[PDB]
Amino acid sequence: MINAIRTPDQRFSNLDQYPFSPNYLDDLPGYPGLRAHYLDEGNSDAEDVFLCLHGEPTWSYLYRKMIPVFAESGARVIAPDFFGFGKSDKPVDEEDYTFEFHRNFLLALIERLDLRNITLVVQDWGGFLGLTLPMADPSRFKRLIIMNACLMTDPVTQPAFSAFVTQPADGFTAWKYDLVTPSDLRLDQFMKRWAPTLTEAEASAYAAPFPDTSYQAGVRKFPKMVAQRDQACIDISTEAISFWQNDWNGQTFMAIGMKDKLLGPDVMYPMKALINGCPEPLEIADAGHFVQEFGEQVAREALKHFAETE
Ligand SMILES: [Cl-]
Secondary structure, three states, rough: OOEEEEEOOHHHHHOOOOOOOEEOOOOOOOOOOOEEEEEEOOOOOOOOOOEOOOOOOOOOOHOOOOOHHHOOOEEEEEEEEEOOOOOOOOEEOOOOOOHHHHHHHHHHHHHHHOOOEEEEOOOOHHHHHHOHHHHHOOOHEEEEEEEEOOOOOOOOOOHHHHHHHOOOOOOOOHHHHHHHHHHOOOOOHHHHOOOOOOOOOHHHHHOOOOOOHHHHHHHHHHHHHHOOOHHHHHHHHHHHHHHHHOOOOEEEEEEEEEEOOOOHHHHHHHHHHOOOOOOOOOOEEOOOOOOHHHHHHHHHHHHHHHHHOO
16 A cells, blocks of 8 residues: 565675574554564563664664563563664655654554563664653563763753754764765765774664665655654644653663764763753763664663662
8 A cells, every 4th residue: 555665685684693583473453464573582571671763764673682681681672663773664655654653663563562661662763762661561560771862842941952953063964965965875874974983894784774766765864854744743742741741750861972962961861860860970982873883882881870779
């Protein structure tokens, strides 16, 4: 119904450090004929579920160094790929990707798999979407690991959540230009620029899902939804603030990638004040936007903060 295409499996033959088996769902309510891929690691009967949400322009491959740390602690780890990315199917029209299209996929997934005692792990788009989830069914969420991300509220309510869009020029302006303009977008080159510590092999794992441009409509729309927030996004993100501030009673762990020009200190300090009981953030000095590429340390530390409370 939604015209989509699927990445050929051979594209993922030679992945580096990604020995996780695939799981797929193609029966989601509202998502007819669309197949979603997701990792399901560690003990499936575990009490604790770590739900790892990726952002722009990556996939579950992003959490590859984190997954094993969480699985080794005795937690089941779920890492889905959004429609348009990684091993999931990719709608071909940019108009098909909306804030609600991606948000409703997540609620559907959560319900379909019946996840409970969830430790939400977010970053970038994983957080813009992810942070609006608990208020829809609060009994399923218990903890939060927040890396560089915020809420897509209107500019008046939270100016810090809108300011990074225009300044600095080598920040979100540069990122968006790099993503929406090339007619021949090479994700491996983009990734090596924005995550300078990646090896050649790691960089190509991020280009793997996209043989050509026809596969990159969701990649292209994400940055535009940051710049042009529709009303449902604004209303839902505005309503999530109240939830974080007054309603949330779980545990939180925050890590900030200090070299991030998009969502660094001036976006995440303000986020820290809105999350009831959020503690002092772990500042990672050598980390950029993709904190996850210094993921083992964050996972290790997060588990240690959480255990010092059980
Ligand atoms: Cl983006």
